Design a protein around this ligand. Structure first.
Ligand SMILES: [Zn+2]
Ligand SMILES: [Zn+2]
Lengths: 306, 306
């Protein structure tokens, strides 16, 4: 029993973290097989980030300008190229600690673990979610760029996020491992406002199921609702509209607990309209939306990873 | 910027996890040098846990009855002994992945990371705290016994917790790595009620400093207080009494932010007496007490680990 915000074990990713330095700028890179992936703004000075022309800046860089250090060992760079907003540094040595891995572009509402790193060294691991407005709410100080987000399925690490930017509002933006930003953001120090931070309804419901499974049940009520009726309430409270696809994904949790998805929606409706009256659910005083239905099933059954 | 509940990178501990089976019972062990540490109730049947005589049960076990598997490899057990509530299985092979390590018995209010494991395989990592009543609020399903809690200082893993028991109230009890339970709990399936779950005042204050550093400032007020006056309020709200030792530990955070410890206490006093009026601090709608002052300084400065 008990339910915690839980990150994936980070060892497989720790073995892939390297330091990348170009000129006066040092951030983190990801070493997989014989390629190191890092944010392209490693080639920028602080002044460059106001309006960088990355293709022109990269013309002034050669392979030997990219200093790559894996712990104490220096890696030899034998090629470099830019793919969207990431650089791919080809090195002459395959990472012997390369895990089975994939690159995946995640959807808003999906969760992943972040291994915060500085100077190529891991600092901590935590869980977060791709917000509907394509930001993440992380913990990143200067030097953390190139830290990555990931999911693990048994023995395969699916890399989904590379950190690039902090918005002036303190939220975070980054890319997939193909270098494409999530959302409209760009690797330029400019005005970039985030859209509405909408709540991930299907994740709140999954978390309510997790609560019931663990004995927090005070919020269950005698009511039901419909998708269209619930969504009128979701709109009022800046929740994502619930779809039948979401209802289907919650099916296993509905089956396990015997609480129909729409009955749980009616519990959520009352919590939105009335608040939590000074009480808590799973140690939280607000509705938590960074557990997916798959996260809940995983933690409530005890799935492991090779 | 940003502040997250962050666990230590778990790779060093992942390399120490093994599966231990005795008879029909399987849990987790910790393999360090040529010793495997696990809960002694691995020798119990479910029936035994109502009133086990561990010394009598262990007389019926030989070295070959302790099956120890590190991933796919079987370890050869060449000796066994009981130390308090843990078993020490001597094996014929030193763990080649043994990190620099220490065993430490932590104090209530201190935090640590837990690597939840099943069948010797890591499942997830999360942060938690030793509660003042010597329980922890974890995420442990059947099979998770022998999972460990730990802190990391640069390259040295300080192991502080081994999981043994879930109380009927759903909280968790365990031992240090010398086998001594935290608090009054015993490895017997009996009536064991936990004392008052008191809030860790010094940690709440540290977290308020973290909030200010990150721009959440609405709760600062025009007031101050004294230690004795604040503690009258702490008592009313089941908070730990604040001592001058706590004030001293918060000194660096006071110095950095320019907010005197007792002024922050007056902010906390008002939050306790008036609530949070439907607002949030660092994404929480309640006062968070599982960040230590050292946790806050670490995450706000970006310390890493070899
Ligand atoms: Zn950067
Ligand atoms: Zn057990």
């Amino acid at each position: 029993s008990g339910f915690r915000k839980m990150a994936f074990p980070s060892g497989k990713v720790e073995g892939c973290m390297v330091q990348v330095t170009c000129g006066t700028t040092t951030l983190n890179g990801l070493w997989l097989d014989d390629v190191v992936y890092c944010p392209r703004h490693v080639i920028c000075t602080s002044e460059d980030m106001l309006n960088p022309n990355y293709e022109d800046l990269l013309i002034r860089k050669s392979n030997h300008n990219f200093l790559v250090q894996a712990g104490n060992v220096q890696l030899r760079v034998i090629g470099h190229s830019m793919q969207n907003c990431v650089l791919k540094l080809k090195v002459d040595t395959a990472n012997p600690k390369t895990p089975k891995y994939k690159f995946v572009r995640i959807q808003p509402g999906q969760t992943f673990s972040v291994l915060a790193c500085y100077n190529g060294s891991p600092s901590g691991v935590y869980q977060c979610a791709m917000r509907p407005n394509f930001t993440i709410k992380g913990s990143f100080l200067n030097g953390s760029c190139g830290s990555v987000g990931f999911n693990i399925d048994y023995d395969c690490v699916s890399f989904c996020y590379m950190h690039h930017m902090e918005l002036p509002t303190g939220v975070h933006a980054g890319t997939d491992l193909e270098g494409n930003f999530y959302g409209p953001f760009v690797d330029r120090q400019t005005a970039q406002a985030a859209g509405t931070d909408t709540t991930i309804t299907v994740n709140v419901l999954a978390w309510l199921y997790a609560a019931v499974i663990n004995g927090d049940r005070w919020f269950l009520n005698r009511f039901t609702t419909t998708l269209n009726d619930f969504n009128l309430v979701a709109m009022k409270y800046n929740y994502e509209p619930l779809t039948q696809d979401h209802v289907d994904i919650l099916g296993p949790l509905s089956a396990q607990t015997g609480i129909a998805v729409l009955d749980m929606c009616a519990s959520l409706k009352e919590l939105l309209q009335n608040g939590m009256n000074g009480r808590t659910i799973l140690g939280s005083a607000l509705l938590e939306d960074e557990f997916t239905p798959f996260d809940v099933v995983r933690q409530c059954s005890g799935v492991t990873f090779q």
